[PDB]
Design a protein around this ligand. Structure first.
Ligand SMILES: *[C@@H]1O[C@H](CO)[C@@H](O[C@@H]2O[C@H](CO)[C@@H](O)[C@H](O)[C@H]2NC(C)=O)[C@H](O)[C@H]1NC(C)=O
Ligand SMILES: *[C@@H]1O[C@H](CO)[C@@H](O)[C@H](O)[C@H]1NC(C)=O
Ligand SMILES: *[C@@H]1O[C@H](CO)[C@@H](O)[C@H](O)[C@H]1NC(C)=O
Ligand SMILES: *[C@@H]1O[C@H](CO)[C@@H](O)[C@H](O)[C@H]1NC(C)=O
Ligand SMILES: *[C@@H]1O[C@H](CO)[C@@H](O)[C@H](O)[C@H]1NC(C)=O
Ligand SMILES: *[C@@H]1O[C@H](CO)[C@@H](O)[C@H](O)[C@H]1NC(C)=O
Ligand SMILES: *[C@@H]1O[C@H](CO)[C@@H](O)[C@H](O)[C@H]1NC(C)=O
Ligand SMILES: *[C@@H]1O[C@H](CO)[C@@H](O)[C@H](O)[C@H]1NC(C)=O
Ligand SMILES: *[C@@H]1O[C@H](CO)[C@@H](O)[C@H](O)[C@H]1NC(C)=O
Ligand SMILES: *[C@@H]1O[C@H](CO)[C@@H](O)[C@H](O)[C@H]1NC(C)=O
Ligand SMILES: [Ca+2]
Ligand SMILES: [Ca+2]
Ligand SMILES: [Ca+2]
Ligand SMILES: [Ca+2]
Lengths: 673, 848
């Protein structure tokens, strides 16, 4: 509903709420009614006498610009404009469509530690297969190569002059001295160059169990011209079999200077590696994002679970189980590419907190998400349109500004222009000035007055004293103090005072409402600005909150177990907190401590189901209501008792959703006395 | 705010690495390491002892050994003030052996003079972090056992003990345990906390305790984000200064968010056998990605003067690696405040500062003013952020006369008088003399602040506002200024109101180096005083009333803290004699309660703490009576004592004397909610055969597992009833209670006779064999402290005696023993419904 803080001009009604509306007809206000009545919820305006052509919300709206000649537009509209309103979100439908024929640039960055010897043996004869598999998706592909080991300093590698020459543990074998990063091959469409340049690489080794490849990826991002990236799809395969060093590890080597992310390549070697630490994971993640490079973490089975956590930090990255000899590189790359292209993340660039950009996603295969922080969809087919309902809420009447929406991993962007629709376009200015006593001017049906006059019709001059007959009308009843003692009558309306105490606004028609008198939660009125606002004894909540002081949420409920039932079916939950019956405990009621084992009294049930005995006088199905037998073992309480035949029935009783219902699994190897 | 930067003292040195590590030393000396300054062949790292008086630094004449060290000396430092000790370690001693160059640590312990010192599992880097215990230095090896970690605790230069975790499937490899270390005091007994910033890839921090001589790891916590590097720095904080540690701070400088970098978390000490868990997280400013917030941690003691320990946290990555430092206050609830109190930025100090805040040290006074000083490290610079004394201002406005005379206001030469008193006080204790602290204060007085056309003006300005400035000492100072009313007032409904708001500027202390006082950030900067008009409710007489208050916890027997969470009291207020103006009722109640709502008059209320409720402002009619339900919220973890003393008294603008009925107090019993569950267990011998040919001795056991699922540690008295004899024949021989958890308790036995003599017919009626068919013994075990969330297996064991077996109609008999948990009902109670499980029984069935 339209809650109004003493509004007195058309645009103030829009600032004062998302559902509020203004009406322009002159008949809408009588002598005893304040101009604030112009602002209320739309049906009440219709009931009072407003009309569909006399009303002006104004609704937040969008304009979409598109190119007719542009075929297979991967991200449309090209640019949009929003006449945003505070609180009332605008919506517009950005459409995504997967295109064909977009080439691929593949850079292969590999660990050269001693455990990667066989992987390096297999990779050096893989360039042609990788390039052809790139061509099997889209034509005109390119490949590259890159290598890392670790920083050339203790503890990470021993600095003895003999061991620096030959760091690999097998002394007999011939191996290259340690290095941080070496750029090996330029991005080319020739397989011969790949099989030539890579073949000159030799194995190496460090001392520590992690490796430095985070700073190699940081250099592969920092050196665009040397690597050879086009403005096309860029892939970065990262092949490791163990963990990585990251920022902070350099203190053991007396290194404390941060990695700066600039291109420090000299003669294809990352010289000056020891004067910089390792980068943080956030450095790599952020820098790859601002260059449209998509990491493919080819990691071994033991490291998969560790590397999955990077994807929460790095969108447009994929992790795949790499074999112990990197035999499945091509299949892993293809699967990662399919996952990357089907998983279309659609996210904006950073924007002021005054904008609450929100996405509704109508994905393709029947799934739909609501109020997600970023657009989410999966299984995006080729040439199958997808729709994202971008919901943009302002709360400010923002100054005209702009942000960019982008489909992550793609250069295509949507420019969004945003403008304050808070101004009013009332046509009443054409009316004669006689209505404003010849002093003010009439717009939206209210006689707006200059600095020299005040009042509903500019009847009261700012220099003249207030008439007693006008002051006497600012009372609810004979017992009410003038303006409730918290204001003054100015031309028949209470000009409210302000309170030196923090946050105490005084408002309402007779200056009788204070925003601090509602009942408190955690010592704050309505829980503070973060939960709701006070209207002289009544609390209005933001969406997602309810109750007398907005202390009770209506969303992201903690009542719900992962099976989507309230308190596991054995308790109501008032105000997001489950309330239980009997000896059940918070929060999800999953287990009951203290209640004795009921196994001894369900023997009457287990005696029938698993053994298929006939009725016990009373029918078996009615003898054991609310229970099911499982064909597979189940987890929970274990029990053993004696049956009617004197045999040991060893069974388990897993509790499930609802009240007094379980699953029973009984051992078939019956033993009897 | 408190830490000074306008006149910050600075040390410069062209030494490579100068400012990497700083520790304060007793007096006015600071030891600064330069872990990269080369001074000789194969020698890098030297100590620089810096003095406030000399304004410079000279190297400590240390006799470094000749074993091709490259110690990187000064990378780690430690010190204590009583006795005077200081520890310097070189983590990286490059021992170039025949095949490999190992890295070990070498350690220097100094006394009062920095002249000569002792110097006394490869790859260990023994002195990566250092601490001085009450028996010697504590050295941390980040690289022991394949970079798993560990520490060496030294009692003497010849004897030491290694401390680390138990090894489980190489999960602790590369963890770097000992990358940070700290000492926690438990009843003045030394205990250890260690950090592993690389654990797996998420991080880990653990506590080590001296449980019966040996060092064991009892609790540990883990980090969330990969690469956040959780555990880089540790800081044990004793917030309350009682002599026991309260919190451990765990820094994760590389936590990554879209607009933030780095976080620190608060982990209060676990109580009893409870699991250790975090409860808060701290963050730097937004828009400062890669700020490395939480790289440096230190204890500054009490900075603002409130007896609660405060922490400073380094953020050297902010503003393009020019860095910042964050000050966090400790809170009275044994916590740390979620938001920083001060940020010091290297930009505002000097353009030359890089990596500002990479090192911190605090705990001692170096300026000899009596205030703790913080020393901060930077690349080639060291600064002394001296803590400035905190000044609070108490303003007393006393209108004379106390109320506006009737003839002065009733319908422009009319006048009044107000006395304003500004009193400046120190929140901290220090060595500054009287008269040294000078402050310049400017304040504004506003008559009818918040209203247009104010009803009163000042005499010396002839308008409703006055600004005044003066230089004030640390003592009571007063000045009196007259007031005027420019008009008559025909609506005397609300007083004249005076507002005072001020800003304080502290003059620099010339003797101590231009140190300035600072006004407290939480000090009340706005003061309001009411100048009420005279009333006329009578034959021109002065107003008076007989206001009284009574209230009762009606239909309420005892207050249960654990539930329900809300209780409300029927407060009634009665007035007699004459009308009362602006009646306010103040409720004084323990800190653990809070105020929610007031219901049924224009009745509105605002919040030993206090709560003032406005009973129908401005007036409360003749002979009126009002009843309302002041609703309070009781904390779940509250501790109100044995009884809670609510105290409320009423006041009015008439300022009548404190009659005996104007104050009411009524203590109600406090009865802490506990929830204890006792149950049998499956291992109990629930069934046996029948044996009647000859008597036998067979052992059987009933385990009445006891748990505490509430949030109160309580003393319990636990009782078993065990059959011992039936028909003059023993069923049990010697029932021996046993506890497997070794908790301290004592047990005894008592025997009592059966309640019924009809054992020949009760068996015919039912096959139950308990203390109503047989003689039973009573084993009572007293436990003085049963803690929170702890369980023990109270078990009974003894040999059954088949000397009484009765061949009744039922082919089975039941030996029943019942265990019920008695507790002092005067203080403790069970919750309704769920409290039926305080007792349990176990039956041993005997049949074919
Ligand atoms: C903690 O320290 C103990 C020794 O104080 C370590 O125990 C040794 O572990 C190695 C691992 O291969 C064995 O070879 C030794 O035989 C063990 N020694 C003893 C006396 O048991 C233990 O590994 C360390 N654990 C961690 C996590 O660092
Ligand atoms: C976007 O499309 C969906 C159907 O996919 C439709 O329900 C919705 O109304 C559209 N958005 C707008 C703003 O019309
Ligand atoms: C010691 O440090 C010097 C200075 O950098 C260096 O030249 C020398 O090789 C180092 N010696 C060892 C054994 O690390
Ligand atoms: C008192 O407050 C007013 C308004 O906030 C401000 O303009 C004035 O400067 C303050 N007085 C002082 C002495 O700072
Ligand atoms: C007072 O407490 C009772 C019992 O909790 C509750 O039902 C009632 O709503 C509360 N408030 C009033 C005004 O009675
Ligand atoms: C106050 O609460 C009690 C119970 O807590 C209730 O019986 C009584 O009616 C309440 N008083 C009012 C005025 O609602
Ligand atoms: C009311 O109680 C408070 C509690 O400290 C006391 O200070 C005060 O003197 C009492 N009387 C009045 C009239 O406030
Ligand atoms: C003993 O057993 C009888 C029969 O089950 C029961 O009624 C009684 O409560 C039990 N306890 C005592 C103390 O008699
Ligand atoms: C009690 O004994 C059982 C079986 O020996 C065991 O599973 C249980 O953990 C024990 N209780 C406690 C608190 O350890
Ligand atoms: C009980 O039986 C055990 C084993 O059968 C035996 O060792 C013990 O001496 C017997 N008596 C007592 C009092 O425990
Ligand atoms: Ca391999
Ligand atoms: Ca303490
Ligand atoms: Ca403090
Ligand atoms: Ca000082």
């Amino acid at each position: 509903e339209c809650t109004k803080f003493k509004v007195s001009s058309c645009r103030e009604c829009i600032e004062s709420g998302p559902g509020c509306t203004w009406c322009q007809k002159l008949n809408f206000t009588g002598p005893g009614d304040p101009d604030s009545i112009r602002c209320d919820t739309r049906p009440q305006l219709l009931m009072r006498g407003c009309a569909a052509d006399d009303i002006m919300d104004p609704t937040s709206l969008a304009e979409t610009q598109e190119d007719h000649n542009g075929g297979q537009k991967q991200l449309s509209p090209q640019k949009v404009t929003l006449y945003l309103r505070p609180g009332q979100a605008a919506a517009f439908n950005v459409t995504f469509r997967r295109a064909k024929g977009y080439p691929i640039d593949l850079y292969y960055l590999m660990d050269l530690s001693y455990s990667m010897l066989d992987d390096l043996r297999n990779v050096k004869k893989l360039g042609g297969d990788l390039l052809r598999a790139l061509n099997e998706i889209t034509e005109s592909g390119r490949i590259g190569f890159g290598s890392f080991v670790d920083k050339t300093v203790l503890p990470f590698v021993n600095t003895h002059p003999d061991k620096l020459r030959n760091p690999c543990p097998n002394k007999e074998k011939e191996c290259q001295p340690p290095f941080a990063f070496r750029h090996v091959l330029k991005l080319t469409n020739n397989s011969n160059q790949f099989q030539t340049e890579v073949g000159k690489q030799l194995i190496s080794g460090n001392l520590d169990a992690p490796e430095g490849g985070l700073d190699a990826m940081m250099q592969v991002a920092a050196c665009p011209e040397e690597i050879g990236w086009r403005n096309v799809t860029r892939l970065l395969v990262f092949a490791t079999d163990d963990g990585f060093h990251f920022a902070g590890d350099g203190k053991l080597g007396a290194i404390l200077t941060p990695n700066d992310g600039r291109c420090h390549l000299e003669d294809n070697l990352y010289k000056r590696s020891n004067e910089f630490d390792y980068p943080s994971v956030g450095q790599l993640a952020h820098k790859l994002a601002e260059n449209n490079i998509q990491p493919i973490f080819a990691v071994t089975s033991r490291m998969v679970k560790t590397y999955e956590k990077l994807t929460e930090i790095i969108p447009k990255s994929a992790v795949g189980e790499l074999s112990e000899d990197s035999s499945n590189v091509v299949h892993l790359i293809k699967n990662a590419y399919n996952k990357l292209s089907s998983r279309v993340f659609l996210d904006h660039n950073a924007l002021p907190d005054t904008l609450k950009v929100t996405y509704d996603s109508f994905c393709s295969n029947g799934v739909t998400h609501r109020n997600q922080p970023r657009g989410d969809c999966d299984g995006v087919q080729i040439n199958v349109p997808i729709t994202f309902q971008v919901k943009v809420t302002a709360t400010e009447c923002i100054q005209e500004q702009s942000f960019v929406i982008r489909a992550l991993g793609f250069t295509d962007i949507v420019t969004v222009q945003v403008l304050p629709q808070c101004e009013c376009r009332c046509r009443d200015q054409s009316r004669d000035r006689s209505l404003c006593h010849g002093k003010g001017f009439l717009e939206c049906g209210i006689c707006r007055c200059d600095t020299g006059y005040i009042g509903k019709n500019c009847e009261c001059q700012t220099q003249g004293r207030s008439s007693q007959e006008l002051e006497g009308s600012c009372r609810k009843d004979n017992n009410s103090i003038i303006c409730s003692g918290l204001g003054d009558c100015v031309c028949g309306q209470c000009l409210c005072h302000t309170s030196d105490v923090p946050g105490k606004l005084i408002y309402g028609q007779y200056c009788e409402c204070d925003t601090i008198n509602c009942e408190r939660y955690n010592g704050q009125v309505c829980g503070g600005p973060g939960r709701g606002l006070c209207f002289c004894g009544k609390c209005r909540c933001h969406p997602g909150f309810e109750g007398s002081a907005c202390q009770c949420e209506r969303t992201t409920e903690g009542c719900l177990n992962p099976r989507r039932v309230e308190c596991s079916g054995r308790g109501r939950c008032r105000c997001n907190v489950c309330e239980c019956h009997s000896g059940y405990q918070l929060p999800l009621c999953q287990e009951c401590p203290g209640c004795p084992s009921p196994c001894g009294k369900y023997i009457s049930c287990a005696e029938c189901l698993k053994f298929e005995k006939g009725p016990f006088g009373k029918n078996c199905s009615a003898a054991c209501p609310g229970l099911q037998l499982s064909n597979n073992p189940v987890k929970g309480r274990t029990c053993k008792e004696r049956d009617s035949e004197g045999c040991w029935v060893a069974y388990t009783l897993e509790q499930q959703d609802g009240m007094d219902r379980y699953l029973i699994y009984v051992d078939e190897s019956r033993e009897c006395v | 705010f408190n830490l000074d930067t306008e006149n910050a003292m600075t040390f410069q040195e062209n030494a490579r690495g100068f400012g990497q590590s700083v520790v304060q030393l007793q007096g006015s000396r600071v030891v600064v390491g330069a872990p990269q300054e080369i001074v000789a062949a194969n020698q890098r790292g030297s100590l620089y002892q810096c003095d406030y008086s000399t304004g410079s630094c000279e190297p400590i004449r240390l006799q470094v050994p000749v074993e091709a060290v490259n110690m990187s000396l000064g990378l780690s430092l430690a010190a204590t003030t009583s006795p005077p000790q200081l520890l310097a370690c070189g983590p990286t001693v490059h021992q170039t052996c025949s095949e490999n160059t190992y890295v070990k640590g070498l350690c220097f312990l100094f006394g009062s003079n920095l002249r000569q010192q002792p110097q006394k599992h490869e790859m260990s880097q023994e002195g990566f972090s250092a601490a001085i215990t009450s028996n010697g230095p504590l050295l941390s090896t980040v690289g022991s056992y394949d970079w798993a970690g560990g520490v060496f605790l030294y009692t003497s230069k010849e004897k030491s003990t290694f401390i680390n975790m138990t090894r489980v499937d190489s999960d602790m490899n590369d963890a770097y345990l000992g990358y940070a270390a700290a000492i926690i005091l438990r009843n003045r007994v030394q205990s250890l906390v260690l950090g592993a910033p690389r654990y797996q890839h998420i991080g880990l921090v653990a506590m080590f305790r001296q449980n019966t001589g040996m060092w064991e790891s009892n609790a540990n916590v883990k980090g969330t984000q990969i690469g956040a590097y959780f555990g880089a720095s540790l800081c044990s904080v004793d917030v309350d200064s009682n002599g026991s540690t309260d919190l451990v701070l765990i820094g994760a400088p590389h936590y990554y968010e879209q607009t933030r970098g780095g976080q620190v978390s608060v982990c209060p000490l676990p109580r009893g056998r409870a699991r250790w868990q975090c409860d808060a997280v701290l963050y730097g400013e937004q828009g400062q990605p890669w700020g490395r917030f939480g790289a440096a941690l230190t204890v500054l003691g009490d900075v603002n003067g409130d007896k609660l320990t405060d922490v400073a946290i380094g953020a050297p990555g902010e503003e393009d690696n020019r860095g910042a430092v964050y000050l966090f206050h400790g809170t009275s609830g044994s916590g740390i405040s979620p938001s920083h109190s001060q940020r010091i930025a290297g930009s505002k100090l000097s353009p030359r500062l890089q990596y500002f805040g990479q090192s911190l040290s605090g705990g001692q006074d170096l300026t000899m003013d009596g205030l703790v000083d913080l020393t901060v490290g930077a690349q080639g610079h060291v600064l002394l952020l001296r803590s400035q004394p905190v000044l609070r201002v108490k303003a007393i406005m006393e209108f004379n006369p106390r109320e506006v005379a009737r003839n002065v206001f009733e319908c422009g030469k009319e006048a009044g008088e107000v006395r304003v008193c500004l009193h400046v006080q120190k929140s901290t204790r220090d060595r500054l003399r009287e008269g040294q602290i000078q402050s310049v204060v400017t304040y504004d007085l506003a008559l009818d602040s918040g209203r247009p056309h104010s009803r009163a003006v000042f005499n010396e300005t002839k308008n409703s506002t006055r600004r005044q400035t003066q230089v004030l000492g640390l003592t009571q100072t007063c000045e009196t200024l007259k007031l005027q009313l420019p008009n008559c007032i025909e609506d005397p409904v609300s007083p004249i109101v005076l507002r005072l708001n001020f800003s304080l500027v502290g003059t620099p202390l010339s003797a101590f180096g231009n140190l300035r006082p600072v006004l407290a950030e939480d000090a009340q900067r706005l003061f309001t005083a009411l100048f009420p008009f005279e009333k006329n409710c009578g034959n021109d007489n002065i107003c008076q009333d007989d206001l009284s208050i009574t209230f009762s916890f009606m239909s309420l027997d005892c207050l249960v803290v654990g539930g329900p969470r809300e209780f409300n009291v029927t407060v009634t207020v009665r007035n007699d004699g004459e009308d009362s103006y602006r009646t306010q009722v103040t409720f004084f109640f323990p800190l653990d309660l809070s105020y929610r709502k007031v219901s049924t008059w224009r009745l509105a209320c605002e919040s030993l703490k206090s709560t003032s409720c406005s009973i129908n402002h401005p007036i409360f009619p003749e002979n009126s009576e009002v009843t309302f339900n002041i609703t309070f919220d009781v904390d779940s973890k509250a501790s109100l004592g044995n009884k809670l003393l609510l105290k409320a008294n009423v006041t009015s603008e008439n300022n009548m004397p404190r009659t005996n009925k104007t104050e009411f107090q009524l203590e109600l019993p406090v009865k802490y909610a506990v929830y204890m569950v006792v149950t049998s267990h499956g291992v109990s011998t629930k069934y046996l055969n029948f044996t009647a040919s000859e008597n036998t001795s067979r052992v059987m056991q009933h385990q009445y597992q006891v748990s505490n699922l509430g949030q109160r540690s309580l003393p319990i008295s636990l009782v078993f009833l065990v059959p011992v004899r039936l028909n003059q024949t023993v069923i049990w021989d010697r029932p021996q209670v046993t506890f497997s958890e070794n908790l301290s308790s004592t047990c005894h036995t008592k025997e009592r006779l059966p309640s019924h003599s009809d054992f020949l017919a009760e068996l015919r009626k039912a096959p139950v064999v308990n203390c109503s068919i047989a003689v039973c013994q009573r084993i009572q075990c007293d436990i003085p402290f049963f803690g929170i969330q702890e369980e023990f297996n109270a078990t009974l064991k003894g040999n059954l005696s088949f000397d009484w077996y009765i061949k009744t109609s039922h082919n089975h008999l039941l030996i029943v023993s019942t265990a019920e948990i008695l507790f002092n009902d005067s203080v403790f109670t069970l919750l309704p419904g769920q409290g039926a499980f305080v007792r349990s029984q176990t039956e041993t069935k005997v049949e074919p």
